[PDB]
Amino acid sequence: GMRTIDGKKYYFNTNTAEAATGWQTIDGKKYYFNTNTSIASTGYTIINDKHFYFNTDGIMQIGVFKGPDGFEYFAPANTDANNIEGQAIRYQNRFLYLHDNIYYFGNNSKAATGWVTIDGRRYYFEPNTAIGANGYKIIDNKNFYFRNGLPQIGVFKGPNGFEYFAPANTDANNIDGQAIRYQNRFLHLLGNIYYFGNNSKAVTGWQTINGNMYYFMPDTAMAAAGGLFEIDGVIYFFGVDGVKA
Ligand SMILES: CC(=O)N[C@@H]1[C@@H](O)[C@H](O[C@@H]2O[C@H](CO)[C@H](O)[C@H](O[C@H]3O[C@H](CO)[C@H](O)[C@H](O)[C@H]3O)[C@H]2O)[C@@H](CO)O[C@H]1O
Ligand SMILES: CC(=O)N[C@@H]1[C@@H](O)[C@H](O[C@@H]2O[C@H](CO)[C@H](O)[C@H](O[C@H]3O[C@H](CO)[C@H](O)[C@H](O)[C@H]3O)[C@H]2O)[C@@H](CO)O[C@H]1O
């Protein structure tokens, strides 16, 4: 019987009206009831000069969580110098993969947040979680499209349409991957063809431009090009320049 009164959770040894203290394994879960108050620990907690992290319900967590000195890695037993389960450990200058989530830990064993350069590459880790960014992101009024923390160069679909996340210095000295103003013009990138309207977004569907007909795929905004394509069940030929002929 584990009850919670006045926002404070306790673990009673059933038959006696007394609350328990210390580490307790309840339902496979680990809890630490402060030895001087019997109150269940929550959040960043120092125990015997070691760091542990508990959720709002007092359950000990394994992962990357923020403490007063930044995000620490509360790892499984024997991750470094036979550390105990849930304890924060020394983890310096290296990446951490917690199944598809990527973190990078600095020299201080704290996870990096914001923009950082690692081995010559620019990354962005979410300040709220320290997790490498993924997908469309607006950062300081600039748009990026990330994959595992890395800004990608290319044409990707965002909330407002396909934007051109361009190579560095294409406009206003943008850095690699920054979405830019690119209006009423074609974009030729690695063999693919796109056309951007006045809104700096790639057009899709059938389009007549300067008298030539093109069909830009709705899922990629790339022009049909270099052969026969069946569109809406009809077969057409598109030259390597994307023009139907
Ligand atoms: C103030 C600051 O950030 N200084 C950095 C130190 O915190 C950091 O020391 C490591 O910090 C982690 C927490 O992020 C742990 O405290 C770690 O020690 C703990 O784990 C060890 C096993 O890995 C061992 O069990 C210790 O007994 C236990 O306390 C600690 O080494 C250092 C090193 O990165 O950098 C400082 O800049
Ligand atoms: C709702 C809508 O579609 N509005 C259109 C604007 O988004 C568009 O503005 C441009 O949009 C691109 C993204 O597609 C960028 O946001 C661009 O600004 C950014 O790049 C600039 C350099 O090229 C500069 O660095 C800015 O600081 C940076 O924010 C922005 O101009 C406009 C113009 O095409 O059309 C609207 O219809």
UniProtKB/Swiss-Prot annotation:
Cell wall-binding repeats: 1-18, 20-39, 41-60, 92-111, 112-131, 133-152, 183-202, 203-222, 225-244
Record-listed alpha-D-galactosyl-(1->3)-beta-D-galactosyl-(1->4)-N-acetyl-beta-D-glucosamine 1 binding positions: 80, 87-90, 107-110
Amino acids binding alpha-D-galactosyl-(1->3)-beta-D-galactosyl-(1->4)-N-acetyl-beta-D-glucosamine 2: 171, 178-181, 198-201
Knocked-out gene: effects: Cells lacking tcdA display virulence and cytotoxicity, because of the presence of TcdB. Cells lacking both tcdA and tcdB display a strongly reduced virulence.
Disulfide-bonded cysteines: none
Family indicated by similarity: Belongs to the clostridial glucosylating toxin (LCGT) family.
The protein's name in its UniProt record: Toxin A
Part of the full-length chain shown: 2461 to 2705 of 2710
